[PDB]
Amino acid sequence: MSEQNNTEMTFQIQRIYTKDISFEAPNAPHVFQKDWQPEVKLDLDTASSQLADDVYEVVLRVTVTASLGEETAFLCEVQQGGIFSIAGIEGTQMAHCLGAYCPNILFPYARECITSMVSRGTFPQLNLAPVNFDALFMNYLQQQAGEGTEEHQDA
Amino acid sequence: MSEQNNTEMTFQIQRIYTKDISFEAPNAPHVFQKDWQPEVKLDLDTASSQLADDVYEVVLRVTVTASLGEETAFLCEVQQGGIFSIAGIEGTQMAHCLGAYCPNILFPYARECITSMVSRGTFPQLNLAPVNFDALFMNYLQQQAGEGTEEHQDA
């Protein structure tokens, strides 16, 4: 469970890149005169890939649909792939790595690649709020303790 | 890297955008006929503004220099601004949020805006590599070890 401070488990990013991208403004010429009430659906897809010994590529395909009530405003779907060399210390320990912190690596890039297509599609600024999955997986691994407050009263 | 730690943190991305963009090649005609092998001198500078209580602008200046020796290939500077909500955590955890985690959000935006500007100046692709300020801050407070690639596949 890696109870002691040491950093037994080890991480090295080989590469990060989009393996699939798709933006769709189906009613684009019409959608700008329509009522701007974006009801944005969030849909997560997972893709596995092993490239070599200890070289594992985990991919997260994030889907963002925007609907103005009944009419679709746009769609933004980005399969954010990332080659990650992950080894040394397995089980729930490594599961917190590949299934929690590795998502947190790809997630800023998957956010931006969606936000870029929205901005290129001339729609208002759209950013999905940051979710720290890994901390809430430590909550189940061995709970969240260790309240630090290294404070510095000065301006 | 074995810590539990609380989340709490009242965080919401208010708005992300490029405050400043630039790309300079005054040697542009002369440099295109050169063999492409530049010494990429990076620069990382920090800026901010208080907009309200608990509403703070994180700006990170990303400046990429490229010099083929005495020949300057190009200069590129993108100052990626991002308004973020900060509350809940205080001290080194709040410092982790600002000095690593919040410009980590801004990293892919700054990155694409630089590599776009390079390709606008018709220089070959120069993509910024993933730098974990977060993991570098995980290094202090404790001991830092690292396991090697074991190389194991079985069926």
Partner: peptide, 25 residues
Amino acid sequence: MKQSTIALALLPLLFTPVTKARTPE
């Protein structure tokens, strides 16, 4: 009087593509 902008939640599966990633509940 508070609101929150759109966000994700914990992945209700916790994907484990790598071998030996045993998750004993």
